[PDB]
Design a protein around this ligand. Structure first.
Ligand SMILES: *[C@@H](O)[C@@H](NC(=O)/C(=N\OCc1cc(=O)c(O)cn1O)c1csc(N)n1)C(C)(C)NOS(=O)(=O)O
Length: 496
């Protein structure tokens, strides 16, 4: 005797108010079979107007002849819905429902996400903020006889309360650029998949989060599972060489190391019992601390790790958020793993230092680079617009963080460095990685402007299927292109 009035779901906008998910009116048709059974001559026209087969439709009504309510179709356009009401079939009733429209479609599919057949969040923000966005359904009183004829909508028991508007931290302008450049990078490199995250180092905001493959959330048929994966938050991977800046932060905080110190890495290998630590380039002897990062020496970083101890390194990585809960509350978001010991064996000490054996998400890696860029201060991650910035936690000392920033600027700008990550007009800083899963993931993590950091970025390219696979070759030019555009879109003054 009482029906549910569906509430208008809260609008999702980007940080500048551009619409990202909009509640659109749709017409749901239901029928009182007992009443339909008195107008059988009308069924074929009704069947056609609903997009059902004549006999299948008549089979469906006959079976439910005793029932007082059945749905005919859900989510017709109010125009298609009018056409059925125009038929004037006895026992046919309509309910005004809501279906989401995603104006930017595939461009921000994984971050915004989508709703199910019931207008409930299923993925991404739609799911995470489902309670805020859903509002509360209405309740009304109706007069119905024995044949089930809806005589009159007597009174409203409770009025439907709409959902609340939500402004994301995402900047659709930076999102379009990140989407486009990641898509082009995947095609050029013949890659299986990719992720790209942009963060505001000062506010903790995620300014862009894109993955490949993507999907159109407006095309509700086919939807391929693999295409719907929000890899940036769900795919865990070994960060490899991109963790070396954190091992270096612990070295500089220990009091035992300064940038001009030297480590002898010759012959480019180091035996630790059954295990052998190996460098890619094996034509070095003495390297200073910056040289260890430029050359990306697994041996160099392992030797520093043995001197300072793995506890100091684990602590920096844990404090920056590697293998830690982001607090974003996205159901199914992976936390990964950061290994821990009471007594760190030599092999585990070395592997921790060069990012082997730990598992992280592109979001955690981006958040960690944000803390280092933000002069050692970690500001809580946010997927919504931050108007009042929360207090950050000083995780790395400002002096150490500033020293590490300078070394990462030399990684990008020095002789033998990652020249493809250079951002024309600006001083950029970062570190490449290559993680053997022969199948690899190409990685680049960095920030800019090196002199006053504003944005951190992580580019992850999964299984590049061309001549070059190293992070410095495959992901570094994507960071370059996306950073050059993002800094200019944010009117960041060039610092070079
Ligand atoms: C840093 O990312 C570092 N990478 C590694 O040491 C890893 N893999 O390497 C690639 C590799 C490994 C092999 O065993 C082999 O036979 C051939 N390869 O090409 C690594 C770390 S964690 C993980 N799962 N794999 C390095 C030295 C390559 N530097 O990265 S970059 O060159 O600065 O990008």
């Amino acid at each position: 005797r009482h029906i549910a009035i569906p509430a208008h779901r809260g609008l999702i906008t980007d940080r500048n108010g551009e619409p990202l998910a909009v509640s659109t009116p749709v017409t749901t048709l239901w029928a009182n079979p007992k009443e339909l059974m008195t107008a059988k001559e009308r069924w074929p026209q009704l069947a056609a107007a609903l997009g059902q087969d004549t006999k299948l439709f008549a089979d469906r009504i006959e079976q439910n002849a005793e029932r007082e309510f059945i749905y005919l179709v859900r989510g017709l356009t109010p125009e298609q819905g009018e056409g059925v009401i125009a038929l004037k079939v006895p026992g046919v009733y309509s309910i005004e429902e809501f279906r989401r429209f995603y104006p930017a479609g595939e461009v921000v599919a994984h971050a915004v996400g989508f709703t199910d057949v019931d207008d409930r969040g299923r993925e991404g923000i739609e799911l995470a903020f489902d309670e805020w966005l859903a509002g509360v359904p209405g309740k009304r009183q109706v007069l119905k006889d024995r044949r089930g004829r809806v005589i009159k909508d007597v009174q409203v028991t409770k009025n439907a309360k709409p959902g609340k508007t939500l402004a994301l931290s995402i900047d659709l302008r930076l999102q379009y650029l990140a989407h486009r450049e990641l898509r082009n990078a995947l095609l050029e490199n013949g890659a299986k998949a990719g992720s790209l995250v942009i963060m505001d180092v000062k506010t903790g905001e995620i300014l862009a989060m894109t993955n490949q493959p993507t999907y159109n959330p407006n095309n509700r048929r086919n939807l391929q599972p693999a295409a719907m994966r929000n890899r940036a938050m769900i795919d865990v991977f070994e960060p490899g060489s991109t963790v070396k800046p954190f091992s270096m932060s612990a070295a500089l905080a220990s009091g035992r190391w300064k940038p001009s110190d030297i480590v002898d890495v010759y012959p480019g290998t180091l035996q630790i019992g059954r295990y052998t630590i190996r460098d890619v380039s094996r034509n070095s002897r003495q390297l200073d601390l910056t040289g260890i990062l430029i050359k990306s020496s697994n041996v160099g970083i392992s030797k520093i790790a043995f001197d300072i101890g793995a506890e100091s390194i684990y602590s920096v990585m844990q404090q920056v958020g590697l293998g830690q809960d982001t607090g974003l509350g996205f159901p199914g978001e992976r936390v990964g793993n950061l290994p821990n010991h009471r007594k760190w064996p030599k092999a585990e000490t070395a592997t921790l230092a060069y990012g082997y054996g730990l598992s992280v998400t592109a979001i955690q890696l981006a958040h960690a680079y944000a803390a280092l860029a933000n002069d050692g201060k970690s500001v809580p991650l946010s997927m919504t617009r931050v108007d009042r910035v929360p207090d950050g936690v000083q995780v790395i000392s400002p002096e150490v963080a500033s020293t590490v920033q300078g070394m990462l600027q030399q990684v990008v700008e020095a002789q033998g460095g990652v020249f493809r990550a250079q951002v024309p007009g600006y001083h950029a800083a970062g570190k490449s990685g290559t993680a053997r899963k022969n199948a690899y993931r190409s990685l680049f993590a960095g920030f800019a402007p090196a002199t006053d950091p504003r944005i951190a970025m992580v580019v992850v390219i999964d299984e590049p299927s061309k001549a070059g696979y190293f992070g410095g070759l495959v992901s570094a030019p994507v960071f370059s292109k996306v950073m050059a555009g993002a800094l200019r879109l944010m009117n960041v003054p060039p610092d070079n």
